[PDB]
């Protein structure tokens, strides 16, 4: 049980007509090493209104996802980001107002409003990048590490404490290296990933290749049981948690571009998901690290749901001590989580996390047909919290 | 109304507040505080805590603060060496807000919901601000310009007039007089024991701050009447009818109701209810205004029931806005001043005014029944606690 609950009841009134993200490239030293924060968020933002022929004077709201930028940073980038996409002055831009969080909220709180009358028309966004444009709107390692690093340690202790084995988290990493190489490899990722065009530059020569990043390059598809297992602990001498049982901050960015269910359909565009449900819930501090083990339950009960009703999750892998011990303690089927892969594999966009899952779940239950009716994407905001959204398929 | 979303505590009559201080508040810009370090202003409050209440430091469940100036890691580092000063040991987990910006009402809330929760039964919600650093402007400004510049555009929309709002800055710096004059600020503060050089010889002279230094008595409509508008030309505000950053602490000692009656502790105050809200995104910068309704509602009260409110001054654009689109009674509101006056310590803020209101309710005795403390949290969010009057 939570401390207490913020719930969002969207009814049927809110539903996503697209949503995206980028590919996501390992922050040290990745595809995007040479790619600037809004040129990540740009195409992002542009896609959602090339997909559906808005006027992006019609939007009414974008909230954003955004951690490892310091202060004013965070909202030059985002505005930048947004100015580059072709939206006018009148479309506030505004920051998910967390130290540390996973950007999920950004995508309820526009729900959120939606739900309440405020506009018709709103984008849920998350970017991350390690990369600092020269060029500002009219330090980031630490950030990461700030948020991470007490993420780890409190996770190693939880895992610790209700024993979640080194075999068990290295397993889960192998299983999401397996799961995302398979789903790179099949073609499932090409409905989400808008490819970013850009430039990389060799480190040797100095020159400026032109790319196009369409793949997410943190995937390891020789990973093994055995290859982890040779791995060192990465915070205390007899830890459980490596660098290969845990994520890496990469460099990304992710939207969703939701509306009122009659605005959507006057404007003739097809219903990718229908938001029903949001929880953020405030965790026992006794145990911190467990925050969607508690949103999950949180979230699918106020749906009028149960846990077994839902046919998919997403749930952000930061860590497999967390991720395992959440799986576990729910007993959730391990073949409805994370199925094309997850963020040990593609990697953590801190702030895009929660729009890139969303773009994730409902692309998947759109492919896997009528039947994948539910899904859950579920992670943390910070060490105190979960959130936890639940969505039913749209009907196309 | 209307808001967005709502977070709801309900904490019935099981969480009492046996104790609550702050320290003085000392302009950042070379007020009194800027050679004392953060953890020398928390250190004592925290210590307030424990002393008045004979607690053992190791029986605390959560130490809960609310800073916003310090970057990254640097916030839990401040606050563990404040702790560590003042006598809690590795076993007393301290945690910080997790938001970019904010007053830190939310850390009292939160460590009032674990309680009733039942996770422990005694925890601190405090908070921190210190523009000096321990061997910040700039997160400074990230949180108080864009709510100055949008609160602006909220009073321009609104109605809300330069003479009403320098008005509010009078009346703040009048009342922040009488009440240091008056000797209402002794309950409630602990004063610091601390270093000051002396900028004119370069002196290290050995003071103890016990006044809020940035009250100024002479504040007149005519002294504010002359001051440049500080966000655009033809704007609003000011720096007089808008608060400064301060320096300063404030903590709050929270426990169940039974502990505290086996422990022979006199109830300062009853925390009721906790509303925060996300706001209407075309009118940022009034959450106040749609939190307070919320708290009440919750607690099953109405706005007249209400005796006093600690409302932040953080703009008089903003704070002029709460009261007057809720029609509260500008004679229960901020009775002994408020930020413009006494400085707005960001993070601080929420323990800061739930000490005031509290020992101001108990100063005015039974008939002052029921309290509001409300602030932002960001531009996008406003947060109001219900209080009642303690025994």
Redesign the interface.
């Known amino acids: 049980?939570?401390?207490?609950?913020?719930?969002?009841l969207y009814g049927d009134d809110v539903v996503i007509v697209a949503a995206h993200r980028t590919p996501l490239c390992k922050s040290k030293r990745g595809n995007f090493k040479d790619t600037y924060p809004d040129d990540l968020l740009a195409p992002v933002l542009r896609a959602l209104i090339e997909k559906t022929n808005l006027n992006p004077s019609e939007v009414?709201?974008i909230v954003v996802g955004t951690v490892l930028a310091?202060?004013?940073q965070?909202?030059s980038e985002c505005r930048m980001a947004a100015f580059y996409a072709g939206f006018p002055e009148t479309v506030?831009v505004?920051?998910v107002?967390?130290?540390?969080?996973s950007g999920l909220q950004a995508v309820?709180?526009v729900a959120?409003?939606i739900?309440?009358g405020?506009?018709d028309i709103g984008i849920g966004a998350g970017l991350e990048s390690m990369t600092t444009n020269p060029m500002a709107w009219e330090k980031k390692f630490?950030?990461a590490?700030?948020c991470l690093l007490?993420m780890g340690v409190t996770s190693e202790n939880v895992a610790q404490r209700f024993g979640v084995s080194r075999q068990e988290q290295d397993q889960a990493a192998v299983d999401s290296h397996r799961k995302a190489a398979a789903a790179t490899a099949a073609g499932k990722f090409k409905d989400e990933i808008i490819p970013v065009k850009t430039k990389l530059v060799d480190p040797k020569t100095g020159d400026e290749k032109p790319i196009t990043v369409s793949v997410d390059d943190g995937i390891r598809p020789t990973t093994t049981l055995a290859s982890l297992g040779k791995l060192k602990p990465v915070f205390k001498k007899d830890g459980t948690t490596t660098a290969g049982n845990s994520s890496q901050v990469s460099d990304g960015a992710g939207a969703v571009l939701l509306m009122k269910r009659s605005v959507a359909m006057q404007k003739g565009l097809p219903v990718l998901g229908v938001f029903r449900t949001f929880a953020?819930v405030?965790v026992?501090?006794?145990i911190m690290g467990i925050g969607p083990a508690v949103a999950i339950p949180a979230a699918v009960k106020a749906a009028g749901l149960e846990l077994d009703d839902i046919d998919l999750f997403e749930i952000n892998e930061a860590f497999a001590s967390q991720f395992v011990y959440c799986r576990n303690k729910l007993g959730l089927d391990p073949e409805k989580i994370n199925v094309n892969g997850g963020a040990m594999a593609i990697g953590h966009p801190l702030g895009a996390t929660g729009a890139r899952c969303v773009a994730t779940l409902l692309h998947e239950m759109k492919r896997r047909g009528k039947d994948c009716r539910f899904g859950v994407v579920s992670m943390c905001?910070?060490t105190?919290?979960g959130a936890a959204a639940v969505f039913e398929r749209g009907d196309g």
């Open positions: 049980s939570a401390a207490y609950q913020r719930t969002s009414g709201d310091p202060g004013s965070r909202a506030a505004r920051t107002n967390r130290q540390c969080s309820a709180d959120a409003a739900k309440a405020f506009y630490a950030q590490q700030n007490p953020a405030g026992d501090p006794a905001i910070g105190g919290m």
